Amino acid sequence: TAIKTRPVHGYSKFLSTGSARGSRVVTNKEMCTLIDSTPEWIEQRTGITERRWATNSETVASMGTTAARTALERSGLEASQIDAIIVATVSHHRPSPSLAAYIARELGLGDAAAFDLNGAAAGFCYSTALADSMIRTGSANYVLVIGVEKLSEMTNLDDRSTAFLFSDGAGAAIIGASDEPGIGPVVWGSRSDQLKTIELEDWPTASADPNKIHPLIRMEGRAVFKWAMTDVAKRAAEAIAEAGITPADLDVFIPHQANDRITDVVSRHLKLPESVTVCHDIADMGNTSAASVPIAIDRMLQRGQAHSGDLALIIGFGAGLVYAGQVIRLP
Amino acid sequence: TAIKTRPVHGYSKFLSTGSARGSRVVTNKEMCTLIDSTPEWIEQRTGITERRWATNSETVASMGTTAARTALERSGLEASQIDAIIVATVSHHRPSPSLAAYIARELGLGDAAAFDLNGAAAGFCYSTALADSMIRTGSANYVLVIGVEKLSEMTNLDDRSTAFLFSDGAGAAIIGASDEPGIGPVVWGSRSDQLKTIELEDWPTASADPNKIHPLIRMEGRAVFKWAMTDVAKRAAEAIAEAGITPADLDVFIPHQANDRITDVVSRHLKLPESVTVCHDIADMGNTSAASVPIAIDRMLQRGQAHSGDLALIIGFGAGLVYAGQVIRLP
Ligand SMILES: [K+]
Ligand SMILES: [K+]
Ligand SMILES: [K+]
Ligand SMILES: [K+]
Ligand SMILES: [K+]
Ligand SMILES: [K+]
C-alpha cells in the first residue's frame, strides 16, 4: 500500500516585518553604575553605546505579540489566515505550553501549527528555513516567525565581561508562498564539541539558590570571536554561494549583532564591496540573541538602510555551538 | 537579481527506532501511598497500572542519548552521517544551549543542524513532519528525532487528579531520504483559545518558592477528554485521508498514550477494523508526553505487536492545545 504526499511546489517569501524592543533605554553611563566598567571600554570592545531592556510589564509574550501584530497589520492578511507560528527563544521560562501557543491565543489565531524552537542566537534563521520548507511542502501557507528574548533577567551584573552585552525585544516576520525564490537555502549546523563556550545555568540550580531567581549567562567571549571569525565566516560565504549569487550581489548583510568586531571581520572575509550595507545596529541595541536579526531587518527597513526587494544575507550563531544563515529578499 | 534553491528529490522514511525509559517502576500500589486514591480507580479512569520514573542519575540528556544510540546502531549509519538532530521536550530545564546540543556532543555528531522543539505531547509528530520536510527540500539527509521527558519532577503529588498520570523516558528515530514515501502529510494545528486546559507553572514562580524546586503540572483532564474525543479524532481521520488511504489500510494505530478511553473513542470514531492493532501501552507506560509515540513504536516493534513495513497512524496532542499526526511506514 502506497502513501501519498503533498507535492513540493513553489517557494516562499517574507511578506512583512515588525519589532517591539524593550522600552527602557540603558546607556553605558547608567550601565557603569550597575557594573564595574567604563562607557568607553564598552564602546571600544563592542560598539555598544546603549541597549534596550524590557520593563516588568514587557514579557516575552507581550513583546512577541506586539511585534507580530505589527507584522500582521503590514501584511494585509487576516489573523485567521495564519496557519503556523514559530517562536525562537531561550527566554520562555515556562515548560509548557509553548510561547507560540500563548502568542497564538493573544492574536486569536485559529487552527495554526504552533511550536517553540531553541536554536540559541541562531533561532530566527533556523525558524525561517523551517517556515520555507513547511510552505513549500504544503503543510502551511502563512507562517508567523518570531524571535524574542528577555536576556536582562539572565544577565550577570557581577560579570563585567558580559553584563554590558545583552538586551530584550522581539522581532517578527510573516512568510508566505511565492512564485519565485524569496528565501535561499539554509546553511546550518553545530559544533557541539565546543558546547562549553556558552552555557547558561540550569533552572534547578537557580531555583535552589535563595539569593537569585533566574539562571545566569556565561560566555567565553574570546572563544566566541575566534569561532565567529574562523568558521562562521565560512558558513556565511557558503550561504551566499548556495543562493546562487556573489557577495557583490547582496544589498545588505545582517548578522546576529554579537560584537562590532565580529561583524567587521566577517564582512572582510566575505570581501563585501562598498555597495553592501552592513548592519551595525548593536550600537543602540546590544545583543538580543534570537531576536537580533528580525529586529535589525525591521529597523533597517524602517530607517531606509534597506529597501523592499533587496537581497540580504541573514545569519545567526550562538550557544551549542549552533549556526544558521540564508539569503532572503526583503519585503 | 534572482536567488536559487536546492534541487528537490524524493521523500523520506523511518530507518530505525530506539527507546530508554526511566528505571524506577512505580506501581499503582506505590502511587496510592503517595496520593489519596486506589489502584482500581486509577486503572478504571486511565488504563494505567504502572509507570516508569527516572532515577536521579537518569537525566533527559542521558535517556535521550541512550535511545539515540540504540536507533543509531540499528540504522547502520555512522554518527558522522547524521546532519540534523531534533529534540522534542518540555523537560530541558536549562535555557541554553539546547538539549539537542548536549546529546549531539554525547554522540559525537559533527556538523549537524541542532534544535529543541516545544510541541508539548505533540512534539514528536511535529518533529517528524519537519524532518520529512527538511529532507525533501535538501537541508538535511539523515535526521535524528528524539522525544524525551522527565515529567515526574513536575508532577504534583498533592494533586490526586493528575499525580498518577506522568512518566519519564526517551524515544528516538532516525529518518532518511527515500525514493518512495515513508511519511505521509502532516495534519497539525492548535486550539490556543483552550490554552488554560493544561498549564505548567512558570520557572520564576518555582524558583522564588522556598519549598519547591520544579514547576508543577496542572491539567483539566475532562476538558482534555472532550477535546480529544471530538476534535483530535477528526484530525486523526484527516491524516489518514491525506495519506490517500482508508482506516482499513492501516496496520497499526499509535496515538500519544494519554488515556485508554481517549485511545478507544478515537479508534471507534475512525471505525478501525479488527485487523488494525491499537497501542494501549499506557497500561505500563503512563503519560510520557513527547516521548510517548516513539517509545510505543519501539516497544511494539520489539514485542512483535507491530512489524517492519506496517502502515501506522501516529498522532500527538497536548498542551496549547496543539496536535500533529501523520501516517508512517514502520522501519
Ligand atoms: K520553555
Ligand atoms: K531561587
Ligand atoms: K567571560
Ligand atoms: K529549555
Ligand atoms: K525554589
Ligand atoms: K485537575
Q: Which CATH number does the domain housing residue A75 bear? A: 3.40.47.10
Find which of A5, A111, A327 to mutate to test the B interface (most B CBs within 10 Å of its CB): A5
A202–B320 C-beta distance less than 8 A: no
Contact B144, B203 (CB under 8 A): no
Greatest alpha-carbon span in chain A: 70
Q: Are residues A219 and A117 in the same domain?
A: no
Question: Considering all CA atoms of chain B, what is the largest pairwise distance in Å, rounded to the nearest integer?
Answer: 70
Cross-chain CB nearest to A210 (options B200, B206, B210): B210
Show which of A142, A162, A181 is a domain's final residue. Answer: A181
Cα dihedral A105/A109/A115/A120 (nearest 10): -80
Contact: B93, A133; criterion CB under 8 Å: no
Residues of B in contact with A100 (CB under 8 A): 118, 190, 320
Of A126, A195, A249, the CB nearest to B115: A126
Whole-number Å distance between alpha carbons of A57 and A282 = 24
CA of A198 to the centre of ligand 3 (A): 9
- Between chains, do A206 and B207 touch, taking CB under 8 Å as contact? yes
Domain termination residue (choose one: A181, A216, A240): A181
The experimental resolution of this structure, in angstroms, equals 2.1
> Which strands form A84-88's sheet, in the order they lie side by side?
A11-21, A168-178, A142-150, A84-88, A113-118, B113-118, B84-88, B142-150, B168-178, B11-21
Whether A15 and A87 share a structural domain: yes
Name the residue facing B97 among A5, A94, A195 (closest C-beta).
Answer: A195
Q: Which of A115, A204, A327 sits opposite B93 (nearest CB)?
A: A204
Distance B293 CA to ligand 3 centre (A): 41
Residue range(s) defining the domain that contains residue A243:
182-330
Q: How far is the CA of B54 from the centre of ligand 5 (A)?
A: 21
CA distance B148 to B54: 11
Say if residue A214 is in the same domain as residue A315. yes
If you measure from the C-alpha of residue A186 to the centroid of ligand 2, how many angstroms do you get, rounded to a whole number? 40
Shared domain for B39 and B128, answered yes or no, is: yes
Buried/exposed A168-203: b ≥16 CB within 10 Å, e otherwise: bbbbbbbbbbbeebbbbbbbbbbbbebbebbbbbeb
- Round to whole Å and give the CA distance between A189 and A266: 18
Contacts of B299-304 spanning 24+ positions with Cβ under 8 A: B299/B19, B300/B252, B300/B254, B301/B17, B301/B330, B301/B331
Q: Would you call the peptide bond into A321 cis, given omega within 30 degrees of 0 as the criterion?
A: yes
Contact flag B133-A137 (C-beta cutoff 8 Å): yes
Write the DSSP symbol of residue A115. E
Residues A61, A194 share a domain: no
Q: Which ligand is nearest to the CA of B218?
A: 6
What technique was this entry resolved by?
A: X-ray
Å from A141 to nearest chain B CA?
Answer: 12
Contact A203 B94 (CB under 8 A): yes
Nearest chain B Cα to A126, which residue? Answer: B115
Same domain, yes or no: A249 and A210 = yes
Burial of A322 from C-beta contacts in 10 A (0-12 / 13-18 / 19+): buried
Asked which of B131, B150, B181 is the last residue of a domain, the reply is B181
Domain match, B70 and B127 both: yes
Report which of A113, A119, A44 is spatially closest to residue A89, judged by C-alpha positions: A119
Distance from CA of B274 to the nearest CA of A (A): 18
Residues A46 and A164 in one domain: yes
Outline where chain A has alpha helix (H): 28-34, 39-46, 60-75, 99-107, 123-136, 203-208, 221-227, 233-242, 260-269, 282-285, 292-302
Write out chain A residues lying below 8 Å of B321, CB-based: 97, 101
Per the listing, cell 519537519 goes with: B130
Least Cα separation, residue B74 to chain A (angstroms): 23
Among A120, A118, A89, A117, residue whose Cα is nearest residue A227: A120
Cα–Cα distances in angstroms (integers) from residue A260 to residues A228, A277, A327, B311, in the given order: 12, 14, 21, 53
CA distance readout (Å), B80 to B77, B105, B140: 8, 12, 13
Identify all chain A residues contacting B129, using CB atoms and an 8 Å cutoff.
139
3-state secondary structure of A139: coil
Regarding whether A222 and A163 lie in a shared domain, the answer is no
Regarding whether B12 and B109 lie in a shared domain, the answer is yes
Contact call for B6 and A120, based on CB within 8 A: no
* Nearest ligand, CA B213: 5
A99 C-alpha vs ligand 1 centroid, how far in Å?
8
DSSP, collapsed to helix, strand or coil, labels residue A136 as: helix
What is the rounded distance in angstroms from the CA atom of residue A227 to the CA atom of residue A206? 29
Interface contact A101-B195, CB threshold 8 A: yes
| B319–A2 CB contact, under 8 Å | no
Min Cα distance B73 → chain A (Å) is: 21
Q: Which residues of A touch B195 (CB under 8 A)?
A: 97, 101-102, 105
Cell 538539549, residue located? B99
User: What total number of domains does chain B contain?
Assistant: 2
In terms of domains, do A177 and A242 share one?
Answer: no
Of A46, A81, A264, A65, nearest in space to A166 by CA: A46
For residue A123, the chain B residues in CB contact (below 8 A) are 115
Same domain, B288 and B150: no
Q: How many interchain CB pairs under 8 A, A with B?
A: 291
| Grid cell at residue B284 | 505500563
